[PDB]
Amino acid sequence: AWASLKRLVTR
Amino acid sequence: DQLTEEQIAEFKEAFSLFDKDGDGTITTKELGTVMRSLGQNPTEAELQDMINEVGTIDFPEFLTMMARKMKDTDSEEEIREAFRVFDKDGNGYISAAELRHVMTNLGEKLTDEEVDEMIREADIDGDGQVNYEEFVQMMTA
Ligand SMILES: [Ca+2]
Ligand SMILES: [Ca+2]
């Protein structure tokens, strides 16, 4: 569910 | 390092929402809106610098801008900035309503229930909204 927001930043 | 296929697809989807005739461009005045839909929080100076470094922006130029921002911005700052954009009223919490608008502005078509499930996954203290550290916990995984 959060994959598309997680893709907006780097780790 | 560089953008994945899925990041490129997501950036293209957000860009295309402002490319009404499909010609691969947005206007310079639309650049900030597109960047904010992608969780960037550019200052006016930052936007004008990007515009000057290239009255339209074409998609390959935009994608090159985004790749550089993703690689060169500190990761902790990237999370802070995305939280600041998504927390539309600045009250320290992303509400279900704010999150619905974020997902819509990315170009997704999630149901209201699917967004509620996003909130529940992230909501550790049970108040039904996502505060900054709850967001960090999601965005650091
Ligand atoms: Ca808020
Ligand atoms: Ca919470």
Numbering used by the authors:
A (entry chain D): 78 to 88
B (entry chain B): 2 to 55, 61 to 147
Article, verbatim:
Calmodulin (CaM) is a Ca2+-sensing protein that is expressed in all eukaryotic cells. AKAP79 engages in multiple protein–protein interactions, including with cAMP-dependent protein kinase (PKA), calcineurin16 and Ca2+/CaM17.
Co-crystallization was achieved with a peptide corresponding to AKAP79 amino acids 77–92. For each copy, AKAP79 amino acids 78–88 are visible in the electron density. Although only the C-lobes coordinate Ca2+, remarkably both CaM lobes engage the AKAP79 peptide (orange). Trp79 in AKAP79 (W79AKAP79) is deeply buried in a cleft within the CaM C-lobe, which is the canonical binding position for the first hydrophobic anchor amino acid. CaM adopts a highly compact conformation to accommodate AKAP79. Whereas positions 80–83 exhibit α-helical backbone geometry (diamonds), positions 84 and 85 possess more positive ψ angles that are characteristic of 310 helices (black triangles). Closer inspection of the CaM–AKAP79 peptide complex reveals that N-lobe H-bonds, involving residues including E7CaM, Q8CaM and E11CaM, enable CaM to accommodate the atypical AKAP79 helix. The CaM–AKAP79 crystal structure reveals three abilities of CaM: it can adopt an extremely compact conformation (8700 Å surface area); associate with sequences containing 310 helical turns; and bind a target using both lobes where only the C-lobe is in the open Ca2+-activated conformation.
